[PDB]
RNA sequence: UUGUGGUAGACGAGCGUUGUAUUGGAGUUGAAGUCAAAGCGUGAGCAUUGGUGGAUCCAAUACAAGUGAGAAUGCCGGCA
RNA sequence: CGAUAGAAGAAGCUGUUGGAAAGCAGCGCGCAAAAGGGUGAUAGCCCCGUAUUUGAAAUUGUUUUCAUACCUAGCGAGAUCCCUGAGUAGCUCGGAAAACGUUAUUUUGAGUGAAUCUGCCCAGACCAUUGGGUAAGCCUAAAUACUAAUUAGUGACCGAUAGCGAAACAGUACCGUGAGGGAAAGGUGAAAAGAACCCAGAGAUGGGAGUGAAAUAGAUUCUGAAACCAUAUGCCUACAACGUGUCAGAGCACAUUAAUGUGUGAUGGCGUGCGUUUUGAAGUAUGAGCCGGCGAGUUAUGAUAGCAAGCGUUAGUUAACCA
């Protein structure tokens, strides 16, 4: 009993350069390398899935503080103004996105000087 | 219960025959019968499947490939299962056990539980050699005798011990029916057919075998 | 089944297994030991549990 | 079950695969180690060798039979607490047949034993009887027959 | 509630491929198969549509795999 | 009673598309034969063949009977009449086979060497009694395996990488003078019914034309994948320290297997491949030019362990063997 596969092996590569593609040079065309890519690529999104929001974090907080400095507060301090007296949970970026917010971010620094 | 006669052209008598109590089982045992439908089924290996093993190709013991200085590996066999020569190192073997040792106590109560679920599924009708010697042959009353019975997607099988040579000659133009001595008979081609004609004189002698 | 002779000559099966063997270091001589071993080695022993199970697949 | 419906019900349980890689479980691997002679295939040293240890059989004293050359003569013992389970006299050759004991194409002597007591008188033959056998038969006043 | 990190290794649940008898079906009003697509599944897979191809295939239950291909300075072929 | 040329051998029309119907649908028949094959796709009614009835000049296998041979084939009374397998059995030195590595048993390379049914041999040393048989000449069908094969049938046998190397003119070619090794490739079409016509050119070749259902059917001839080589829609790049990608993403061009739509990306954050051993390689540890197909834990017997089942109340089970 000869039992071939050729067809569904084909098959099977297939899919798998089908899963990605859009690489320069010879490693979108070349099986066991785009499979070496796709797993480098699954490493790699889950890399961003945690250091991304670790990012945006910092990133976050690097933005309030730089137009804190303007009014003449720093962040340090600011954001233990909210957590000592005045106690609100608006999230830094809400507020990040609300300094640009018109005659907004002056009402929020307004009230927590209560 | 009962169980009566269909005539050629699917005229039902009126004279009915009782079941004897003896003929039904309480209990069922389906491992038994599954291992019998198996053991039929483990028998449609003709061991035809071989193939050339390593000491069983001819072709030269030299090494193709030397020792050193030959980016490839040594393999001193020409031909081999990974190559392209042919043959695998194992392969299929003619020599399979197809062997099952068999409990006849187990047997008997699968066989007679077989019969015993036939004769309750009320899918068996009643038959007599006096209507397999009124036949010639011809599958044209047997063609009547079907289209009466209205029953083709099923195998129709007559558990028979004489074996008219009119009844026998039948069974064959129409692939759809056939005729089988009442002990050829075998759990997996009787659940393959699933509707059944029984001789009126062979109750008794099932019933008494068991 | 064949079973190994070169075992079986210094090992008996008893009843439940419990494999009985005679005790060594006196087939050959006992010149140095004590009266008290010798007839307490004279009681004749049991594979342990791993050799118990060493033998069942030997034999 | 039918011709389109086989299922089982706890049969066919699970294998194992050693070449379908570790997205399957133990591929190359196969659960034998690695780089160890007992990892290579026709490995597994004697069941009596220890890979160079001295093998236990090797240490010890050999038994002696005194019975060497000869084995010892086949009597069937005839228990007494199973055969009271059926009753019957005059038991016999012709009757042991009959009762699943004997061989029904072959001679063999036969042996009496047991240790349960009894009272109903019977008819026993056997070519070899124990003390207490015969003591509990004795007390049930039955007749039996030491082949002589 | 512990959790869901865990090699060796222990253990569990599976998927598909073919033929084996099926209940059934489709097909020169297009089947297997090929290419693509901007689907469903955690996944073994299944679609659906579009194109060639003009003649076989598959859905569901057990059977067996020369069954499922990542390396073996793996084999052959082709292409650099 | 058979084989080797052979004869008979039965059961259909209509409509549709479809190149072609044989498919499908409506009305019938009939099968000792609805096994198979091919005949324009999926033909019970196209055919044979099929099961069956038969037929054989001549070779002619087997069996039975008869005529003809062959030996075959009864019970008694004696007689130590002669005899019943001679270098024979045995003994001794080294062996061989016997489960045995030499012991009961056979033989001897060498030497020696009896006996006569009363006696002799055998009864795992030998011996007493006792039991069996009288060696030391020959032969035999039956149950004994196998296929170079003649033939019939079947393949959970394979389908041009497989299957004997052997589907093609394969043991070919080729190689070593010689032992020997020993490959590769099949498929048009439906019937070549092979592209008439016309044109460029020296023709090959190619193109319109036509047949052909179809020239995605043009002889590289069922289909013709990807890697690889090119072409073009759009996107950007010739100031750029970069496992060359990921998460996003302006802008550019779109509108989909209708879904926060997609292709691409100036730039922002991060951003030293895989398999194997070594505690341990980003590894300058090693293996890989790429791609496609093949490719490596199976079989028997027996046991053990696990699960389940059957059966039993002295259990299950048949080996071998026969239908």
Redesign the interface.
């Known amino acids: 009993?000869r039992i071939k596969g050729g067809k569904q092996t084909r098959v099977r590569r297939k899919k798998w350069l089908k899963q990605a593609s859009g690489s320069f040079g010879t490693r979108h065309a070349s099986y066991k390398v785009a499979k070496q890519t796709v797993i480098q690529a699954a490493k790699y999104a889950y890399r961003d899935r945690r250091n991304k929001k670790r990012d945006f974090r910092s990133l976050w907080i690097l933005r309030l503080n730089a137009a804190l400095r303007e009014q003449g507060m720093t962040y340090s301090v600011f954001i233990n103004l909210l957590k000592k007296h005045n106690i609100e949970i608006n999230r830094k970026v809400l507020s990040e996105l609300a300094i640009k917010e018109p005659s907004k971010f002056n009402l929020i620094v307004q009230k927590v000087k209560s | 219960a009962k169980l009566k006669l269909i005539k050629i052209d699917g005229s039902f008598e009126t004279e009915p025959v009782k079941l004897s109590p003896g003929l039904i089982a309480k209990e069922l045992k389906?491992?038994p019968?599954?291992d019998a439908?198996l053991v039929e089924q483990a028998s449609w290996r003709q061991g035809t499947?071989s193939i050339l093993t390593k000491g069983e190709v001819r072709g030269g013991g030299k090494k193709p490939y030397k020792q050193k200085h030959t980016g490839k590996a040594r393999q001193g066999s020409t031909r081999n299962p990974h190559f392209v020569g042919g043959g695998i190192v194992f392969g299929?073997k003619p020599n399979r056990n197809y062997s099952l040792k068999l409990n006849k106590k187990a047997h008997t109560a699968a066989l007679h539980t077989v019969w015993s679920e036939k004769l309750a599924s009320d899918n068996t009708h009643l038959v007599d050699q006096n209507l397999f010697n009124k036949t010639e042959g011809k599958t044209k009353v047997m063609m009547q005798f079907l289209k009466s019975a209205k029953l083709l997607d099923k195998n129709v099988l007559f558990v028979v011990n004489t074996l008219n040579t009119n009844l026998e000659q039948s069974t064959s133009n129409i692939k759809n029916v056939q005729v089988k001595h009442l002990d050829k008979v075998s759990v997996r081609d009787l659940?393959?057919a699933?509707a059944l004609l029984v001789e009126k004189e062979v109750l008794k002698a099932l019933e008494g075998k068991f | 089944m064949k079973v190994k002779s070169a075992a079986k000559k210094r090992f008996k099966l008893t009843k439940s297994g419990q494999i009985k063997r005679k005790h060594a270091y006196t087939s050959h001589l006992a010149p140095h030991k004590t009266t008290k071993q010798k007839r307490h080695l004279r009681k004749q022993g049991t594979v342990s549990a791993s050799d118990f199970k060493r033998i069942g697949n030997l034999i | 079950?039918?011709?389109l419906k086989?299922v089982?019900?706890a049969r066919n349980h699970k294998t194992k695969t050693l070449g379908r890689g570790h997205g399957s479980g133990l591929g190359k691997t196969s659960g034998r180690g690695q780089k160890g002679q007992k990892a290579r295939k026709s490995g597994l040293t004697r069941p009596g060798f220890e890979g160079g240890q001295t093998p236990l059989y090797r240490r010890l004293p050999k038994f002696g039979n005194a019975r060497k050359g000869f084995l010892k003569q086949e009597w069937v013992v005839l228990n007494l607490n199973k055969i009271a389970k059926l009753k019957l006299d005059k038991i016999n050759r012709a009757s042991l047949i009959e009762k699943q004991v004997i061989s029904a194409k072959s001679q063999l002597p036969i042996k009496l034993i047991g240790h349960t007591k009894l009272e109903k008188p019977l008819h026993f033959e056997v070519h070899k009887v124990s003390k207490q056998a015969l003591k509990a038969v004795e007390n049930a006043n039955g007749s039996v027959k030491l082949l002589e």
Request: charged fraction near 5%.
């Open positions: 009993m | 389906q491992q019968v599954f439908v499947h299929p659940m393959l699933n | 079950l039918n011709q086989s089982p019900k």
